[PDB]
């Protein structure tokens, strides 16, 4: 029953308040998400602080390092969370947690460059083009988004292979399997929300 319309609507709705966040706080969050993507205990610490703050409504205790730089953007001066900002960040952290360490590290690298939009466009294409998701099928990828060298060393290849997708060099490059829906959906949600912060 899941489809791309449902996935897009959910991620789009979750993104609204990040896209309308002021530029300076968006960049502070995004740069520091890039650092905690390389430091899983920091992501878990941030998730623990935001989850308890969202559900309790109480004062949130400051964190150290890059996780703390993110949290500072999400709290009032009294220390309670701004729920409209903490909730989408918690949703993003939940999506990132679905992904493997390898994918998390690749996302951290992509943030710094134009690569992020291209990977979002590619993952969106895989999900749109593989409708109906419950049928195994082949998907062609636009060669222009694949970079200079398309093979098992390419970051987009690894990102997709880590979703459980079987990949090959020649078109159609992606073999879609329904069991890859959950990780690929999380990868899309992650790229989409990271892109909404980077605009």
Curated annotation (Swiss-Prot):
UniProt-annotated site: Cleavage, residues: 25-26
Residues with the S-(2-succinyl)cysteine modification: 14, 149
Region annotation Linker helix loop: where it falls in the sequence: 1-13
Recorded consequence of changing residue 185 to R: Disrupts intramolecular interactions and autoinhibition, leading to spontaneous pyroptosis-inducing activity
Localization, UniProt: Cytoplasm, Cytosol
Protein name: Gasdermin-D, C-terminal
Annotated organism of origin: Mus musculus (Mouse)
Lineage: Eukaryota, Metazoa, Chordata, Craniata, Vertebrata
Gene (UniProt): Gsdmd
Included stretch of the parent chain: 286 to 484 of 487
């Amino acid at each position: 029953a899941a489809d791309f319309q449902g996935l897009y609507a959910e991620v789009k709705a979750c993104s609204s308040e990040l896209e309308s966040l002021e530029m300076e706080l968006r960049q502070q969050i995004l740069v520091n998400i890039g650092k905690i993507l390389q430091d899983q205990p920091s992501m878990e610490a941030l998730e623990a602080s935001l989850g308890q703050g969202l559900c309790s409504g109480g004062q949130v205790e400051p964190l150290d390092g890059p996780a703390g730089c993110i949290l500072e953007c999400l709290v009032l001066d009294s220390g309670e969370l701004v729920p409209e900002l903490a909730a989408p960040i918690f949703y993003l952290l939940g999506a990132l947690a679905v992904l493997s360490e390898t994918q998390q590290q690749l996302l951290a690298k992509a943030l710094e460059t134009t690569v992020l939009s291209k990977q979002l466009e590619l993952v969106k294409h895989v999900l749109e083009q593989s409708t109906p998701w419950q049928e195994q099928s082949s998907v062609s990828l636009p060669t222009v988004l694949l970079g200079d060298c398309w093979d098992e060393k390419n970051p987009t290849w690894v990102l997709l292979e880590e979703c459980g997708l079987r990949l090959q060099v020649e078109s159609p490059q992606v073999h879609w399997e329904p069991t890859s829906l959950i990780p690929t959906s999380a990868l899309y949600a992650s790229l989409f929300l990271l892109s909404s912060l980077g605009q």
